[PDB]
RNA sequence: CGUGAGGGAAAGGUGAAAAGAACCCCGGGAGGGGAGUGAAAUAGAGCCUGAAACCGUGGGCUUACAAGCAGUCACGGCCCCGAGGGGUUGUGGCGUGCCUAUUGAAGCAUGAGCCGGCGACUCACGGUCGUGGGCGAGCUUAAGCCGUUGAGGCGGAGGC
RNA sequence: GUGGAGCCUGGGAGUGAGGGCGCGAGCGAUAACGUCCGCGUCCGAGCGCGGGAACAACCGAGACCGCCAGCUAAGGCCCCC
RNA sequence: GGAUGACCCCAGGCGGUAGGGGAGCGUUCCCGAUGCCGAUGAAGGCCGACCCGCGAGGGCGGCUGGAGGUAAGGGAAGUGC
């Protein structure tokens, strides 16, 4: 059984938001909230909540037990972009790319 | 009457991208890479079934050879030796008996010598 | 894009 | 039917005594041992020659004057950096290099060559210590 | 590209930008440019040689006669101008509508009776083409329309 | 300076094994004597408040 | 016991039991034939000069086949010369039957 | 956008029906997980189909002594599918991108980041051959007129 | 001498920047990967195949397709091969 | 050969740029169509190691998709990047 949630559209760079997503694959709920508590990237608050939010699922409509979760799978995916002009030199307008994560999270049960 | 595009060219970029699985990088992804990396793989095909027969022919004579010098000849003397003695056993063959029936290549250098 | 910033003049290769 | 190719077989250990043979006319020999071109079931892509194991290095033979003519080069990849010994010195310093130089010119480039290489064992002076694996004289 | 809404300014000048020269956004190499060769309005008739048209009448008439797909009838009984009245009739006479027949009559009533029938093409003696008689299986006549397909390919 | 320009796109190869040196490393953690929560050593313990033994600030 | 047996312009190592590819012959499938002998060897040997006198091997014609597709390439650069071929080369599948001599 | 004359876009589609998701859970929200609607919810409004480039997660094979237009031929190893086939690639052999322009290009000569879609030999009238037919010392109508309402016929002026 | 020979009438062209080599000359310096004619040949269009270390035009030879068969050409046969 | 592509047999040709010529594939549309295929699933998409074709292509099968498509035989062009 698991267990998963997806953060749509949070407006930060997926590649910045990987390697918070990289820590935590694999490690148990406990394990995984204790690292993203102490991370020192921006992107460690909005992990945390899709982490959260799937234990939430877990425990409240999937029948698992808090403590037996790990994370089974966690990814993040890129939408959309928000696209802007950055002005230049000499008359010159470049094109910002503001990136988009589609953050998903999916905690199973590791009995024993 | 209007004929836009419409699935006739994906179709047929997709012809050969299929023929180009298993290539490097934009080689199986971009088709105008695809297509010049298979004009490429077609003649090397078109050149090395001609060159198999002589790779082959190359092995079977190297191992012609060492099975002669066992038994004191060289390809050379024992080809010739096969010629008189009118046996047409070709090299394919000559090379299977040399590795699996070492008493039978035995007979042939044996024939070949005596030929001379 | 409407305006085109002039390039460098070259090098005088006389 | 299609040309048969042999399972892999236990490599079989030699022993040449270079004692006042020509250096050249011996190298191929080597190389042809090390190639496995002797052995009916030659097959390129694989090492399946023979384990060579080369004593008196030391007293291998040279005609004309190539002991002061002939000239071994290594560059450093440093501005200057060609060196140059000859091989009245190479044998005076690492005599066991005069032949082995020569072997390995005689084999293929590329990896598998290159772990032919491997194979031979070139000693200077009459003994090498290989007593383990019981090498058979050969008289090339 | 001459009809089309644009102006006709050059958009960037011909050199030392860095993009390829071009005039006007109306040339067919731009979207929404001009198109080079496509339809413009066409007559497309042309006059058929008469005595063709002529030979062709007689011919496809011909062909069917030969196969015994022509049927000459002197009157319309019943037909009245109702679609019951012509069915009723054409099943007295072998038409049951299994096959699509070309009912060539000068009576306005008769074929007021037989047009709205899927098996059945309507048409006056004035008007037999040979399209008409080669779309259909067989071939019926009035004898006052068959005198006048007699008169046309006299 | 004449302006010097990338002379090839990069290959996802390349550009990935550049990043051979990008992961994260996890914080270095350590359990709170006084609490037993999970806190980077040779601070304040967030939670409790306690370092070296005594209630240094409350949290 | 084997036998080197020469068709198709080309030779073949066989023993009973043997099913064995060559090029195609004219014979009905479920037929047999007779195949020349060049060697025989096993528990006695014989040395054709070229072929064995006597000797014979015998073959079932299972049944005739297309070989499965080569795409015969051909490309000339700088000239617009492509060429694009597909071949299979039929072939009849035989069963090896007996060994005369 | 331009002082102005003037220039001048992009942007269509849920579903049969809003039945457009009450209520609960995590969350500041956004978003999600359940519940519910629907034949269908990767039809959920950032909505039909949903290709490609491109980015990611998982798995199989593989790679840290090796020289490379990236493939091709061979054999061997491993994984998959059931005297065979598919995936991979370790060693050996061979191997100078595509287009364009040129006497001659892998060329250190041109063009192209990659993908999708748009994108260039046509039409009218006249001519000249060839060809499929009609008629043949003859052949043929034009504009029009009548009929039809996707029916055809008349019209000989004129032309060859 | 029956050949992708020849001749006649007609439809459609492209080309009208050649280049190397051999031989005969001119120009040049009995120089040039020079230049300009002539006869021939190849590349062009045979940057397809073998040899020549590699290499359009030197030597061998004109590639419809397939073969894990055989004889040769130039060139080769100590090892790389 | 049989009797004017009905298939067979024997022999020969089949490198190719500019270019000439031949035969075909596919796209849009019209007639064939008041028909026929279609929710027991249209077109389009994604696979396929299968079948046919020298090839361009055409089948067939599975998934997706959810409402269209269109034969033999012909006709016309905004027809293949
Ligand atoms: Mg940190
Ligand atoms: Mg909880
Ligand atoms: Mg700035
Ligand atoms: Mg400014
Ligand atoms: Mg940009
Ligand atoms: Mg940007
Ligand atoms: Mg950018
Ligand atoms: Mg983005
Ligand atoms: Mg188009
Ligand atoms: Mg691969
Ligand atoms: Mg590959
Ligand atoms: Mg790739
Ligand atoms: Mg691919
Ligand atoms: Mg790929
Ligand atoms: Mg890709
Ligand atoms: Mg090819
Ligand atoms: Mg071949
Ligand atoms: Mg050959
Ligand atoms: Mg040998
Ligand atoms: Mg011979
Ligand atoms: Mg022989
Ligand atoms: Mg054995
Ligand atoms: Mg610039
Ligand atoms: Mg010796
Ligand atoms: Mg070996
Ligand atoms: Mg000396
Ligand atoms: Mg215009
Ligand atoms: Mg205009
Ligand atoms: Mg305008
Ligand atoms: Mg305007
Ligand atoms: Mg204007
Ligand atoms: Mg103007
Ligand atoms: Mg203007
Ligand atoms: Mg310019
Ligand atoms: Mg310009
Ligand atoms: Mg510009
Ligand atoms: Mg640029
Ligand atoms: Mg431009
Ligand atoms: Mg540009
Ligand atoms: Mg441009
Ligand atoms: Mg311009
Ligand atoms: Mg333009
Ligand atoms: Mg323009
Ligand atoms: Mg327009
Ligand atoms: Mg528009
Ligand atoms: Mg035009
Ligand atoms: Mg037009
Ligand atoms: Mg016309
Ligand atoms: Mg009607
Ligand atoms: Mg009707
Ligand atoms: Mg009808
Ligand atoms: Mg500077
Ligand atoms: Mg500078
Ligand atoms: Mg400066
Ligand atoms: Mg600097
Ligand atoms: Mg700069
Ligand atoms: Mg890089
Ligand atoms: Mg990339
Ligand atoms: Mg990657
Ligand atoms: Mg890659
Ligand atoms: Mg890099
Ligand atoms: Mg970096
Ligand atoms: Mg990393
Ligand atoms: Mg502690
Ligand atoms: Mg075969
Ligand atoms: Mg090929
Ligand atoms: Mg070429
Ligand atoms: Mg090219
Ligand atoms: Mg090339
Ligand atoms: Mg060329
Ligand atoms: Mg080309
Ligand atoms: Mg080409
Ligand atoms: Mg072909
Ligand atoms: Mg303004
Ligand atoms: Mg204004
Ligand atoms: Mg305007
Ligand atoms: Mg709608
Ligand atoms: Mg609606
Ligand atoms: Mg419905
Ligand atoms: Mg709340
Ligand atoms: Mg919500
Ligand atoms: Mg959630
Ligand atoms: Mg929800
Ligand atoms: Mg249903
Ligand atoms: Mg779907
Ligand atoms: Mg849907
Ligand atoms: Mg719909
Ligand atoms: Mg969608
Ligand atoms: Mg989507
Ligand atoms: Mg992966
Ligand atoms: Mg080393
Ligand atoms: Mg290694
Ligand atoms: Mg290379
Ligand atoms: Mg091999
Ligand atoms: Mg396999
Ligand atoms: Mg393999
Ligand atoms: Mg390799
Ligand atoms: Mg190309
Ligand atoms: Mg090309
Ligand atoms: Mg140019
Ligand atoms: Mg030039
Ligand atoms: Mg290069
Ligand atoms: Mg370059
Ligand atoms: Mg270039
Ligand atoms: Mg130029
Ligand atoms: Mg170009
Ligand atoms: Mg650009
Ligand atoms: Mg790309
Ligand atoms: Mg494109
Ligand atoms: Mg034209
Ligand atoms: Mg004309
Ligand atoms: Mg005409
Ligand atoms: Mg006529
Ligand atoms: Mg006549
Ligand atoms: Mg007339
Ligand atoms: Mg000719
Ligand atoms: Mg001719
Ligand atoms: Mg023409
Ligand atoms: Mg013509
Ligand atoms: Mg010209
Ligand atoms: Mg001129
Ligand atoms: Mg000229
Ligand atoms: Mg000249
Ligand atoms: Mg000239
Ligand atoms: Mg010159
Ligand atoms: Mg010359
Ligand atoms: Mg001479
Ligand atoms: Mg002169
Ligand atoms: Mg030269
Ligand atoms: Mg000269
Ligand atoms: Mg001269
Ligand atoms: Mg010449
Ligand atoms: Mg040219
Ligand atoms: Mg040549
Ligand atoms: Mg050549
Ligand atoms: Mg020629
Ligand atoms: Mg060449
Ligand atoms: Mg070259
Ligand atoms: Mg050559
Ligand atoms: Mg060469
Ligand atoms: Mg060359
Ligand atoms: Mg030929
Ligand atoms: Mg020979
Ligand atoms: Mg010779
Ligand atoms: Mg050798
Ligand atoms: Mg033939
Ligand atoms: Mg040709
Ligand atoms: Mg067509
Ligand atoms: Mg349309
Ligand atoms: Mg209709
Ligand atoms: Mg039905
Ligand atoms: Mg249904
Ligand atoms: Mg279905
Ligand atoms: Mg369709
Ligand atoms: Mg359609
Ligand atoms: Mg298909
Ligand atoms: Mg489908
Ligand atoms: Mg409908
Ligand atoms: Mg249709
Ligand atoms: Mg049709
Ligand atoms: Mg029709
Ligand atoms: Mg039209
Ligand atoms: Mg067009
Ligand atoms: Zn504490």
Known sequence: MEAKAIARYVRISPRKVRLVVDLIRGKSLEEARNILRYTNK????????????????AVNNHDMLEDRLYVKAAYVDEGPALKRVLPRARGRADIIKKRTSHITVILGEKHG | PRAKTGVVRRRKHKKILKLAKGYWGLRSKSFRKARETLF????????????????????????????????????????????????????????????REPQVFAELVERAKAAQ | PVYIPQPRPPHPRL | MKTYVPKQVEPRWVLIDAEG??????????????????????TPNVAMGDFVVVVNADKIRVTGKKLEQKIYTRYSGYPGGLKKIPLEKMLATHPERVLEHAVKG???????????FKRLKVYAGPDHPHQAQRPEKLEV | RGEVAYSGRKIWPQKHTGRARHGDIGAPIFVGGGVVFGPKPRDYSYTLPK?????????????????????????????????????????????????????????????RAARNLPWVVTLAPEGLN?????????????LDAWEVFQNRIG | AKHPVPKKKTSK???????????????????????????PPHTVCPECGYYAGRKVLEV | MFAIVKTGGKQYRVEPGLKLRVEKL??????????????????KTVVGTPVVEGASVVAEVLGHGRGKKILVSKFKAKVQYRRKKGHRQPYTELLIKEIRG
């Open chain 7, 26 to 43: 004219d014979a009905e499938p479920g037929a047999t034939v007779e195949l020349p002998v060049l060697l025989l060897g096993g528990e």
């Open chain 4, 106 to 116: 005689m084999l293929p480039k590329g990896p598998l060559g290159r772990r032919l």
């Open chain 2, 40 to 99: 490429a793989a077609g003649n090397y095909a078109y050149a090395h079934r001609k060159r198999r027969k002589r790779d082959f022919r190359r092995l079977w004579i190297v191992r012609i050879n060492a099975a002669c010098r066992q038994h004191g000849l060289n390809y050379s003397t024992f080809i010739h030796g096969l010629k008189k003695a009118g046996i047409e056993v070709d090299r394919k063959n000559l090379a299977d008996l040399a590795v």
């Open chain 5, 51 to 111: 005595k063709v048209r002529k030979k062709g009448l007689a011919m496809a008439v011909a062909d069917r006669a030969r196969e015994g797909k022509l049927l000459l009838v002197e009157a319309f009984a019943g037909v009245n101008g109702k679609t019951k009245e012509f069915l009723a009739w054409a099943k007295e006479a072998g038409l049951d509508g299994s096959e699509s027949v070309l009912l060539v009559t000068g009576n306005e009533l008769v074929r």
């Open chain 6, 13 to 39: 190869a390349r550009r990935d094994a550049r990043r051979s040196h990008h992961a994260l490393t996890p914080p270095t953690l350590v359990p709170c004597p006084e609490c037993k929560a999970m806190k």
């Open chain 4, 21 to 42: 043979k020509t250096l050249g006319r011996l190298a191929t020999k080597i190389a042809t041992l090390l190639r496995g071109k002797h052995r009916p079931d030659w």
């Open chain 5, 130 to 142: 040979v399209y008409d008689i080669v779309r259909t299986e067989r071939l019926v006549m009035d």
């Open chain 1, 42 to 57: 921006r992107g460690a608050y909005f992990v945390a909540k899709v982490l959260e939010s799937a234990a939430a699922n």
